[PDB]
């Protein structure tokens, strides 16, 4: 599309500038253009892709939650009828959010996942697929909700299976995947015990493998382990 005339390397350079400027919509557009060049992404480029879209969808999700809370209050007994505007505007934000999720899922399907053969890259993309189905599930209320939830579950499960076979328990991608799949269990799949079990097992297995790491890898792994602990403390 609009980025078709720009060099791949220039798109990557501009994505990094957009990050520094906190222009995440631009960052995502640049990284979409880079993906659409058709070549595989490096580790750093995968990270830029994830940063860009997570920040974009993060603003939409936070806005959706604000609007959904207002809408729910409007439907309480005793609340004055204010017309269709709250629902309409929540729907507008929701549709935009769904569009961003569909865009990311489309990049993963055409054709990032199918060309990703190394465990790290494949797990990274499958985690992303689970995440964006999870964001679709956060807003889903209709007849496809169960299939959306199962699509998130299936992508996370494939990522977990690969990560357990091919990556050490301290690997940051493996750890972040487990963090997110545990959140999926807790708040999407109505399975808090599974969420807690996964977070605890992931934390304990990472703890046992820290002795193998350099100081820098130790810092990387313990940072994510603390996120698992934060959730365990909140949930127990």
């Amino acid at each position: 599309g609009a980025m078709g005339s720009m060099e791949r390397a220039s798109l990557i350079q501009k994505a990094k500038l957009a990050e520094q400027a906190e222009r995440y919509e631009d960052m995502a557009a640049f990284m979409k253009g880079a993906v659409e060049k058709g070549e595989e992404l490096s580790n750093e480029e995968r990270n830029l892709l994830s940063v860009a879209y997570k920040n974009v969808v993060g603003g939409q999700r936070a806005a959706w939650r604000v609007l959904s809370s207002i809408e729910q209050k409007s439907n309480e007994e005793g609340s004055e009828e204010k017309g269709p505007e709250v629902r309409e505007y929540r729907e507008k934000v929701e549709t935009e959010l769904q569009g961003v999720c569909d865009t990311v899922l489309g990049l993963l399907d055409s054709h990032l996942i199918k060309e990703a053969g190394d465990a790290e890259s494949r797990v990274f993309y499958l985690k992303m697929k689970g995440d964006y189905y999870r964001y679709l599930a956060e807003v889903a209320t209709g007849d496809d909700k169960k299939r959306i939830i199962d699509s998130a579950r299936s992508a996370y499960q494939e990522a977990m299976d690969i990560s357990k076979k091919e990556m050490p328990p301290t690997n940051p991608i493996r750890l972040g995947l487990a963090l997110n799949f545990s959140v999926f269990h807790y708040e999407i799949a109505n399975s808090p015990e599974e969420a807690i079990s996964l977070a605890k097992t992931t934390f304990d297995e990472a703890m046992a493998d820290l002795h193998t790491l350099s100081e820098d890898s130790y810092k990387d792994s313990t940072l994510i382990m603390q996120l698992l602990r934060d959730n365990l403390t909140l949930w127990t």
Binding site: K54, L177, L227, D230, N231
Partner: peptide, 8 residues
């Protein structure tokens, strides 16, 4: 205290 998910 919002639960944590993985932010790249």
């Amino acid at each position: 205290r919002r639960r944590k998910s993985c932010q790249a």
